[PDB]
């Protein structure tokens, strides 16, 4: 009867008429709510990308790093990279479907918000929030475009930085819209929460609204709604929100797994290849392992993904995995030629860096880069202040990131985009334990292995905290139900259940020194797993699982590594370990703890009692 709902006049790239019906309704409905000045339907092209970066550059939002081929630096408002667990929520009808109800009495395993409370929060944030801004429409695929394991999302955002970062971290643009058609998609809505004219001052040219920041997931509506943060997992909605939180629930419903894991292909000196997956928490070295440069001659490691794994059993019973991402969103500090040479090669072109330092010659810098600068070369830190090494504060944010295309990794796996995925033959769990836990062990069965994931603990970055499956920040639903879902894989037709190992790269001696060199040397641990998967009698039984036999690991080229301390298993340590695990599972999982996990707990306690 007027113009009405129709936002066609405001579209500055693409066409509302070209969009699938449901994609149009999502765009237009949110344009009516958020009141953007313009709508830009992203095409994913090189031209779109370069022009948006230059626009951000001209506005002071990013800086060009002149030392490299098409690389960039964003410095954020320091408020927009903090602990946001309290403000990261999942909405379901019943709380218990999202988190187990704890016995006493705050859950560490997720954060639920009622539908009613979320609706009020939403209405207090989104109306008018994009006034004076462009709403970008990002059509994106999580996984290779053709894969039956891939899933499609549409992200609406008012941040150009999100558009640029999503082009790297997902497959995005017109091809995705054409693959989608009338199919289902995850609705992803994001705003930085700073309508124009600005009500509060802009800090460091970085739009955000810390007071109203809220990152919400609505699995039953297939929706992610995020407000107030421009940063990382809060804004690049494909990564944690979709590919872990939403996806873990879809995976529960549909019979597959969405995990905080790397995927790698390892080939031995007789040309035999196996794929492995590994779940470690943030700051425990997934990205180092996924891109490993092995030291043992004749071995080769190739990278499928470094952070998220999606996995489903096929009709042959193979556990097929895809990497749903298109890039690596990797921790910058600590990355060097010695810790990750393949990453260093990857990130020297077409890469966006966030919150790292800049050298006077237009290069990047961070703690642990291990590269001397020429005399006269100076460094600008991440807070835009001159910085000297003798100063107390750090130069780059400790969780600062690179965002790089996966196709540029020199050891990217030839099957990293294969639509059927790669067959997983082993699953590795691990974290930072300074004491008690040996370098590597093998779980005794599937059920024991699920227990091993459930029992994971790690030093916080002193305090040791539970982080089951490295998924504590990411469960899309009740953790006890997640354990039951893992256990149910053993009831599948023809399932070839992978060997579950637990590793510890981080054990230390009584003065604080690491007992194992790690990095490329971890190839020696992977050799042992490869053979154990092959059925080699290289294993000795212990109470916690199988460990390598004396002389089973190749230790040539390493000095006198203290194997007695590194593989030591102490009754007193493991007695304490089991009681703590018992109390945690009772409190935090309570009535939803599967019978099989309580049984594995009882069995471990018993094996320890007989030492
Ligand atoms: N001692 C030792 N440290 C390691 C090893 N591998 C990685 N690290 C350390 O782990 C950290 C790097 O890992 P991150 O990239 O933060 O961990 P991630 O699992 O990729 O984390 P997200 O990307 O946040 O999921 C650095 O502190 C490294 O020193 C190893 O084999 N031995
Ligand atoms: O950003 C990440 O990958 C994380 O926090 O694990
Ligand atoms: Mn991660
Ligand atoms: Mn990583
Ligand atoms: Na900035």
PDB file of C-alpha atoms and ligand atoms in Angstrom, residues 60-61 74-76 204-206, ligand 5:
ATOM      1  CA  UNK A  60      41.827   4.652   9.888  1.00  0.00           C
ATOM      2  CA  UNK A  61      40.167   1.301  10.736  1.00  0.00           C
ATOM      3  CA  UNK A  74      43.623  -3.945  12.918  1.00  0.00           C
ATOM      4  CA  UNK A  75      44.055  -2.514  16.433  1.00  0.00           C
ATOM      5  CA  UNK A  76      40.945  -2.838  18.609  1.00  0.00           C
ATOM      6  CA  UNK A 204      40.827   3.420  18.429  1.00  0.00           C
ATOM      7  CA  UNK A 205      38.481   3.642  15.418  1.00  0.00           C
ATOM      8  CA  UNK A 206      36.943   0.343  16.594  1.00  0.00           C
TER       9      UNK A 206
HETATM   10 NA1  LIG B   5      41.880   0.596  15.350  1.00  0.00          NA
END
